[PDB]
Design a protein around this ligand. Sequence first.
Ligand SMILES: O=c1[nH]c(=O)n([C@@H]2O[C@H](CO)[C@H](O)[C@H]2O)cc1F
Ligand SMILES: O=c1[nH]c(=O)n([C@H]2O[C@@H](CO)[C@@H](O)[C@H]2O)cc1F
Ligand SMILES: [Cu+2]
Ligand SMILES: [Cu+2]
Ligand SMILES: [Zn+2]
Ligand SMILES: [Zn+2]
Lengths: 153, 153
Amino acid sequence: ATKAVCVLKGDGPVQGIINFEQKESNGPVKVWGSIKGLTEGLHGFHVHEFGDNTAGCTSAGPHFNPLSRKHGGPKDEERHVGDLGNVTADKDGVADVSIEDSVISLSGDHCITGRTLVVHEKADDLGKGGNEESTKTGNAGSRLACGVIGIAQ
Amino acid sequence: ATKAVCVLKGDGPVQGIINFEQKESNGPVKVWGSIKGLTEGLHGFHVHEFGDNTAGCTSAGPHFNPLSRKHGGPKDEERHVGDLGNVTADKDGVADVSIEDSVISLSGDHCITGRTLVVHEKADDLGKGGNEESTKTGNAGSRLACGVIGIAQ
Ligand SMILES: O=c1[nH]c(=O)n([C@@H]2O[C@H](CO)[C@H](O)[C@H]2O)cc1F
Ligand SMILES: O=c1[nH]c(=O)n([C@H]2O[C@@H](CO)[C@@H](O)[C@H]2O)cc1F
Ligand SMILES: [Cu+2]
Ligand SMILES: [Cu+2]
Ligand SMILES: [Zn+2]
Ligand SMILES: [Zn+2]
């Protein structure tokens, strides 16, 4: 198996830890962990293109989109590779994450390692919000916390 | 060209920004930036195996060593891929980094992207310290600041 990890931090109270595991080369990737400090509700959750945090999370650029597609949800054919949808926090401010995705990878052209995982201000509308920005970012707003995805033991 | 970047942070005052640029696939990598908050003198400077900062910089593991060599300096044949020697801080606690290295890469088996860059407490003795640990870590002590190396625009 191949494994990766990401520590999420930002300028505010949001922080977390997300693990990735890919049992077979090019197979599905399990994504699991926990994010705290969040407002109750949905928070967009994406791999962005660059692993650059020079100026904070903004330096990561747009969503990771090697195939030059429009934004969508993880279940959609038409999505960015980095489109992992939303995490959902309760009143406790915690989202307990447990996803499997078959588009992201820990190897090859769709490898997310060395790129930035971001948790966003508000909901990702999965490309269904009815403006041009929906089909780019999902209208998920600002970047509360982020980290560079790294190779794990 | 291929580019990468690393933001160095830790639990104390040490922080910095380091850029990587590789003009050609097989070719040397230029490494430059700035680190502040240091004591005067040498601080070991290495790429460590894992891009895992879960528990802080300790989580990054040993020096990156895809060839199972012993520890040395960047100008030695016998070195870990991750052996970038020392940065040197003046009285103001700033080290101004500008080197070139032919062993690290931003692609392939020698790829440092997705791994952790670390600045250490103490001098790296470049494997010349006369003890077993010298040829493993260079006796560079604890990890003052680190970051995961990410793909840059
Ligand atoms: O060794 C270097 N040091 C350095 O500071 N740079 C910076 O990177 C830019 C050029 O790529 C700026 O000219 C310069 O400040 C590049 C280098 F290659
Ligand atoms: O939500 C989770 N999903 C999950 O797969 N795991 C586990 O995933 C396993 C991979 O076989 C373990 O590495 C363990 O981290 C833990 C979790 F909390
Ligand atoms: Cu995002
Ligand atoms: Cu080191
Ligand atoms: Zn997207
Ligand atoms: Zn070494």
